[PDB]
Design brief:
EC number: 3.2.2.22
Number of strands: 10
Strand content: 15-25%
Structural class: alpha+beta
Bound molecules: adenine
Largest sheet: 6 strands, mixed
CATH architecture of the largest domain: 3-Layer(aba) Sandwich
CATH class of the largest domain: Alpha Beta
Organism: Trichosanthes kirilowii
Order of helices and strands: EHEEHEEEEHEHHHHHHEEH
Function: Inactivates eukaryotic 60S ribosomal subunits.
Catalytic activity: Endohydrolysis of the N-glycosidic bond at one specific adenosine on the 28S rRNA
CATH superfamily of the largest domain: Ricin (A subunit), domain 1
Shape: globular
Helix content: 25-40%
InterPro entries: Ribosome-inact_prot_sf, Ribosome_inactivat_1/2, Ribosome_inactivat_prot, Ribosome_inactivat_prot_CS, Ribosome_inactivat_prot_sub1, Ribosome_inactivat_prot_sub2
Number of domains: 2
C-alpha cells in the first residue's frame, strides 16, 4: 500500500509519494530506461491501494489497476464506490470486500464522461495540493453533484502524475496555492496510450515512431514528435502502457 498525508505536506513529500506509487507498479522490462507495465496480472496481484488523508484527518482508500494505472474506485468508511465499467466490476471481486455498502457511480472513469457529468472541462478545474484536499473531502462526504469534478482532481493528482514527470512537478509545486492546468498537461494526458505504443514500436524501428504524436508544448505550440530523442521521451514520460493493454 502507498500513503500520502496532506497535513504538513511539502513539494518534497508529494514527490516521495509519486515515487512510491511508480515503485508499486510491476514492470516486465524497461524500454529506453522507462518501465514497461505488465499486460496481464491475476486479480490477486492486479490492484494496489493508495491511502489519502486530507487536512482534517479524513481518509479515503483508492484502488488502482497496476497494469494501466487506472482508478477503479474508492472507499470512505463503510461504503465503497466503483465506476460503471467492466474493469471496475472485476475489481470489486478483489478490493474493499468488507465494505458494508457498495455504490456503483452513474458513469465510467474516462474523461469525456467525467467532464459531461461535472459540467466542466479539465482546463477549468483547479489542481494543486489544496485542490486534492478538497477532492478528498468531497469524496469522503459523497456529494453526487460534486463527485465527478473531485474524481478528475484525484485522477490527475495520482495516475497522471505517476505517468509524467512534468505533471508530478507542476502539481507538487502548488502546496498552498491552486492553478489551472495548461494545454501542455491536457495533451500529455490525452496522448499517453499513443506515445506508449510508438515507443514500443520505436525499439524495433531504430528509435523512430511509425506514426507521429502531436503534443502541445509550454508555449501552446502543436509540436510533432517522431522519435525517442525527443524531450517528452528522454526526460518526461515515466511509465509505458503495454501494447497489449490498449484494446
Ligand atoms: N479513471 C482513470 N484513472 C486513471 N487514469 C485515467 N484517465 C482517464 N480516466 C482515468
Amino acid at each position: 500500500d502507498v500513503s500520502f498525508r496532506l497535513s504538513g505536506a511539502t513539494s518534497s513529500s508529494y514527490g516521495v509519494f509519486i515515487s512510491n506509487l511508480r515503485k508499486a507498479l510491476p514492470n516486465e522490462r524497461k524500454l529506453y530506461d522507462i518501465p514497461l507495465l505488465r499486460s496481464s496480472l491475476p486479480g490477486s496481484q492486479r490492484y494496489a491501494l493508495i491511502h489519502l488523508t486530507n487536512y482534517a484527518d479524513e481518509t479515503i482508500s483508492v484502488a488502482i489497476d497496476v497494469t494501466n494505472v487506472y482508478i477503479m474506485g474508492y472507499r470512505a468508511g463503510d461504503t465503497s464506490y466503483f465506476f460503471n465499467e467492466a474493469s471496475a466490476t472485476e475489481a470489486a471481486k478483489y478490493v474493499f470486500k468488507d465494505a458494508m455498502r457498495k455504490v456503483t457511480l452513474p458513469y465510467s472513469g474516462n474523461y469525456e464522461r467525467l467532464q459531461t457529468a461535472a459540467g466542466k472541462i479539465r482546463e477549468n478545474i483547479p489542481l494543486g495540493l489544496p485542490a486534492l484536499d478538497s477532492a478528498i473531502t468531497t469524496l469522503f462526504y459523497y456529494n453526487a453533484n460534486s463527485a465527478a469534478s473531485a474524481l478528475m482532481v484525484l485522477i490527475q493528482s495520482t495516475s497522471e502524475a505517476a505517468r509524467y514527470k512534468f505533471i508530478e512537478q507542476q502539481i507538487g509545486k502548488r502546496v498552498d496555492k491552486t492553478f489551472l492546468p495548461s494545454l501542455a498537461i491536457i495533451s500529455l494526458e490525452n496522448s499517453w496510450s499513443a506515445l506508449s505504443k510508438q515507443i514500443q514500436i520505436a525499439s524495433t524501428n531504430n528509435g523512430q515512431f511509425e506514426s507521429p504524436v502531436v503534443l502541445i508544448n509550454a508555449q501552446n505550440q502543436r509540436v510533432t514528435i517522431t522519435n525517442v530523442d525527443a524531450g517528452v521521451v528522454t526526460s518526461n514520460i515515466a511509465l509505458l502502457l503495454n501494447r497489449n493493454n490498449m484494446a
